[PDB]
C-alpha cells in the first residue's frame, strides 16, 4: 500500500469581501474623544488599509496564510483601542458575501470582519492541503498540517464567534468543516504511516479513525438543513465521503489481517481479509461515476486485498486448518485520533508583528 | 506624577491530585495491558504540577502555570476525569480566605485553581513594578489586564463556584479591581505623555467607575464576612482612590476650562477637586507614606491652582462660578479589557504530553 494512488481531497472556497470603511470612524473617534488632530494617525491608517487590500484578495499560496493572520491580529489591536463592535461608537458597516446564497450580509461590527478573515484562513489552508499530490513524506506532512490548520480556524470561529453572522458560519456548518478537515488530515497521516511501514495494528487504528471523522461529517451532510444550504456542494462532498468511509474501513481490516498474520491467528487472518474485501467492494459500488483518481486507488487496493485473501485462505485450508471466526466475535478496531484543530492565538506578536496602533490610547 | 500602591491577590495553596492511579486503571481496561508505556507521560505531568504549585513569583511563573493548565486540557480530552466520570480522582485545594481544604473529584477543579493562580500571579507582577518609566506603566497595565482576563475566564467558563473565593461576586470584584488598576496605570502614562486635559479627565473618571463597582461589592455584607481583614484593607484603599481620582478628574476638567477661558467654570472644577481630595485625605488615615506623599503633593497642586483661579476670577475675569449640577458629568473612557487567556496556546503549552494516551 506504499504505492496506493492518493485520494482526492475536498477544499472550501474563500468568502469575498465588501467594504469596510474604518478610516472616517477612527478619525471621528480620535477627534472627538482624544481632542487630537486625526491626521497624526494617517500612517497607521495606511498600513491597515494596505493590509486589508492584501488580505481580501489574498494570493492562494502559503504566504497568504501569514497575510490573513497578521490582518486578523491588527483588527484585534484596532478593536482594543477604538470601539467598533456591535452597537459601539465608532462602528461602521462591514459587508461580506455569504458564500452559499450569494447574498450581501452587512454588520456594523468589526468582529464580523474578523470572523470572515478567519473563515478564509481556514478555507485557504484547505486549498493548500488539497493542492499537494502527497507523493513524498514532505507532502503528506505539509498537507496534514494544512488540514489541521483549516480545522483550527473553523474551530476557533465556532467557539469564539458563537453568534453566527451568516449561515455559512453557523455552528452546524463549521462542525461539518472541522470534521471533514480532520478526516482529511488523519488520511494524510495514514498515508505517512504506511510509507514508513508502521506497525500494522497502528495503521489499522489510524485508518479506523479516518472512518470515524468521515462518518461524523457524513451525518452532517445528510442533515436536511445542511443539504438545502450547501445544495450541489453537499452532493459532491457526500459522494466522496461516503465512498471513503467504506474504503478506509477496508484498509483498517486489511491491516487487522496483517496483525493476525503476525500473531499467527491464521483463521482470524482470513476473516479480516474477507471483511476488507467486502467493504472495498461496497466502496467500489459507491465510487461509480467518480474520476480515475478514485478508481485507481480502489483498483490498486483490490489487487492488494484480493492477493492477501487468497494467500491467507490457501494457508489456512492446507496448513493451519483454523476456524474462521465471525466478525462479531472479534473486538472492533477503535480509532486513534492523532490530529486536532490546531489552536489559534490571533494576538500572538510573533505572527501579527508590531501593533500598528500602539500610539493610540 | 503620583504613583499609588496597588492591590494584589495571593495564590491558592494546592493539595493532593493523585491522577496516576486512575489513568493507569483507565488505560488497562480501555486500551489493554501494558501500563509501563504511559508512566513517563504521567511523570512529566507530575513534575509539571510540582513546578506549577510551587511556581516562582516572576514573569516566567506565568508560563509554568500556563503550560500546566494546557496539559490538563489535553489530559481531560483523553481520560474522562470530570465530575461523575470514570477516572475522576479527588482534587484538593485550600480556600484562600477561610483556609479550609476543599475537595472535588473533578479535573476542572484543578484547572480552575491553576487559572486563579495565573490571575493572582499577574496581579502580583503588576503590583511589584514601581512604574517609574513608560515601559513599567504599560507592563503593569498588561499584567492587570491579564489578571482581569484570568478571573473573567474563570467567571464565564466555571459558573458553578467550586469554592467561595471563586464565586461570581468575588471574581467580579477581582475583575473590576484589576481593570481599575490597569486603567490607573494608563492614566499615569497619559499624564506623562501630556495627553489633552479632557482625555486625562475621562480616563481618571473611568478609574473611579471601576473602583466604585469594586467598592459596592466590598460593602456587601456576605463578602465582608468572607474576606475578613482583606475586605477592610481593600476597601480602605479603594474608597480613598475613589475620591482621589475623582479629584484628579475634576483637576483636569478645570485645566480644560482654563484652556477654553471659562474662568468661572475653572474655579468650580478646582473647588470641587479640592473638596474631593480632602475627603480622600480623610479616608487615607493610617495609610503608608506612599499614599500620604501622593496626596500631600496633589494638595499642593490643586490647592495652589484653586487659589490662583479664584484670585484671577475675583480681580480680572469676574465670571459666574457655576454650582456643579449645571455641568454635564465627566464620562469615563475605558481603555482596558480582560485579556484572553488562550489556555491551549501551543506556543506556551508545548507538544501534547499524552500523544500515546490515544
Amino acid at each position: 500500500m506504499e504505492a496506493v494512488p492518493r485520494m482526492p481531497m475536498i477544499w472550501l472556497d474563500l468568502k469575498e469581501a465588501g467594504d469596510f470603511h474604518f478610516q472616517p470612524a477612527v478619525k471621528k473617534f480620535v477627534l472627538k474623544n482624544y481632542g487630537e488632530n486625526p491626521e497624526a494617525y494617517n500612517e497607521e491608517l495606511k498600513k491597515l488599509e494596505l493590509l486589508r487590500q492584501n488580505a481580501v484578495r489574498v494570493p492562494r499560496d502559503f504566504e497568504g496564510c501569514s497575510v490573513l493572520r497578521k490582518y486578523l491580529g491588527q483588527l484585534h489591536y484596532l478593536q482594543s483601542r477604538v470601539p467598533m463592535g456591535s452597537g459601539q461608537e465608532a462602528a461602521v458597516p462591514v459587508t461580506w458575501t455569504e458564500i452559499f446564497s450569494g447574498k450581501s450580509v452587512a454588520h456594523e461590527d468589526i468582529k464580523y470582519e474578523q470572523a470572515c478573515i478567519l473563515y478564509n484562513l481556514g478555507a485557504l489552508h484547505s486549498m493548500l492541503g488539497a493542492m499537494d499530490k502527497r507523493v513524498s513524506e514532505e507532502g503528506m506532512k505539509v498537507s496534514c498540517t494544512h488540514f489541521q490548520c483549516a480545522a483550527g480556524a473553523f474551530a476557533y470561529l465556532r467557539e469564539h464567534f458563537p453568534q453566527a453572522y451568516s449561515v455559512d458560519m453557523s455552528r452546524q456548518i463549521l462542525t461539518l468543516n472541522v470534521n471533514l478537515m480532520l478526516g482529511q488530515a488523519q488520511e494524510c497521516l495514514l498515508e505517512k504511516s504506511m510509507l514508513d511501514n508502521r506497525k500494522s495494528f497502528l495503521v489499522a487504528r489510524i485508518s479506523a479513525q479516518v472512518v470515524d471523522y468521515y462518518k461524523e461529517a457524513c451525518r452532517a451532510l445528510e442533515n436536511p438543513d445542511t443539504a438545502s444550504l450547501l445544495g450541489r456542494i453537499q452532493k459532491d462532498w457526500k459522494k466522496l465521503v461516503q465512498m471513503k468511509i467504506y474504503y478506509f474501513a477496508a484498509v483498517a481490516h486489511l491491516h487487522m489481517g496483517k496483525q493476525a498474520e503476525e500473531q499467527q491467528k491464521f483463521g482470524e487472518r482470513v476473516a479480516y481479509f474477507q471483511s476488507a474485501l467486502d467493504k472495498l467492494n461496497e466502496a467500489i459500488k459507491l465510487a461509480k461515476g467518480q474520476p480515475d483518481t478514485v478508481q485507481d486507488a480502489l483498483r490498486f487496493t483490490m489487487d492488494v486485498i484480493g492477493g492477501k485473501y487468497n494467500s491467507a485462505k490457501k494457508d489456512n485450508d492446507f496448513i493451519y486448518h483454523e476456524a474462521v471466526p465471525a466478525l462479531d466475535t472479534l473486538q472492533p478496531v477503535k480509532g486513534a485520533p492523532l490530529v486536532k484543530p490546531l489552536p489559534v492565538n490571533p494576538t500572538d506578536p510573533a505572527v501579527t508583528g508590531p501593533d500598528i496602533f500602539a500610539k493610540l490610547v | 506624577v503620583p504613583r499609588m500602591p496597588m492591590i494584589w491577590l495571593d495564590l491558592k495553596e494546592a493539595g493532593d491530585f493523585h491522577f496516576q492511579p486512575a489513568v493507569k486503571k483507565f488505560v488497562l481496561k480501555n486500551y489493554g495491558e501494558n501500563p509501563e508505556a504511559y508512566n513517563e507521560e504521567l511523570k512529566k505531568l507530575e513534575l509539571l504540577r510540582q513546578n506549577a504549585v510551587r511556581v516562582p513569583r516572576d514573569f516566567e511563573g506565568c508560563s509554568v502555570l500556563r503550560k500546566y493548565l494546557g496539559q490538563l486540557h489535553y489530559l481531560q480530552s483523553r481520560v474522562p476525569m470530570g465530575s461523575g466520570q470514570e477516572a475522576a480522582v479527588p482534587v484538593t485545594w485550600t480556600e484562600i480566605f477561610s483556609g479550609k481544604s476543599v475537595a472535588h473529584e473533578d479535573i476542572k477543579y484543578e484547572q480552575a485553581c491553576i487559572l486563579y493562580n495565573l490571575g493572582a500571579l499577574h496581579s502580583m507582577l503588576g503590583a511589584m513594578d514601581k512604574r517609574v518609566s513608560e515601559e513599567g506603566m504599560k507592563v503593569s497595565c498588561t499584567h492587570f489586564q491579564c489578571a482581569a482576563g484570568a478571573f473573567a475566564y474563570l467567571r464565564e467558563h466555571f459558573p458553578q463556584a467550586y469554592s467561595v473565593d471563586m464565586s461570581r461576586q468575588i471574581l467580579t470584584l477581582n475583575v473590576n479591581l484589576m481593570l481599575g488598576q490597569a486603567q490607573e496605570c494608563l492614566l499615569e502614562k497619559s499624564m506623562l505623555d501630556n495627553r489633552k486635559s479632557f482625555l486625562v479627565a475621562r480616563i481618571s473618571a473611568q478609574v473611579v467607575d471601576y473602583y466604585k463597582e469594586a467598592c459596592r461589592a466590598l460593602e456587601n455584607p456576605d463578602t465582608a464576612s468572607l474576606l475578613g481583614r482583606i475586605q477592610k484593607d481593600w476597601k480602605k484603599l479603594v474608597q480613598m482612590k475613589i475620591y482621589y481620582f475623582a479629584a484628579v478628574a475634576h483637576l483636569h476638567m478645570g485645566k480644560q476650562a482654563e484652556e477654553q477661558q471659562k474662568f468661572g467654570e475653572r474655579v468650580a472644577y478646582f473647588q470641587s477637586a479640592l473638596d474631593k481630595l480632602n475627603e480622600a485625605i480623610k479616608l487615607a488615615k493610617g495609610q503608608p507614606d506612599t499614599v500620604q506623599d501622593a496626596l500631600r503633593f496633589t494638595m499642593d497642586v490643586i490647592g495652589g491652582k484653586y487659589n490662583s483661579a479664584k484670585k484671577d476670577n475675583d480681580f480680572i475675569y469676574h465670571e459666574a462660578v457655576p454650582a456643579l449640577d449645571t455641568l454635564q458629568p465627566v464620562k469615563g473612557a475605558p481603555l482596558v479589557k480582560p485579556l484572553p487567556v488562550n489556555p491551549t496556546d501551543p506556543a506556551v503549552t508545548g507538544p501534547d504530553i499524552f500523544a500515546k494516551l490515544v
Partner: peptide, 20 residues
C-alpha cells in the same frame, strides 16, 4: 515563528510516540 513547520516536523515524533 515556525509554528507550521514545527507541527509538520513533529508528526514523525507523534507516530513514534504512538508506536512505542
Amino acid at each position: 515563528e515556525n509554528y507550521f513547520q514545527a507541527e509538520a516536523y513533529n508528526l514523525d515524533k507523534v507516530l513514534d510516540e504512538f508506536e512505542q
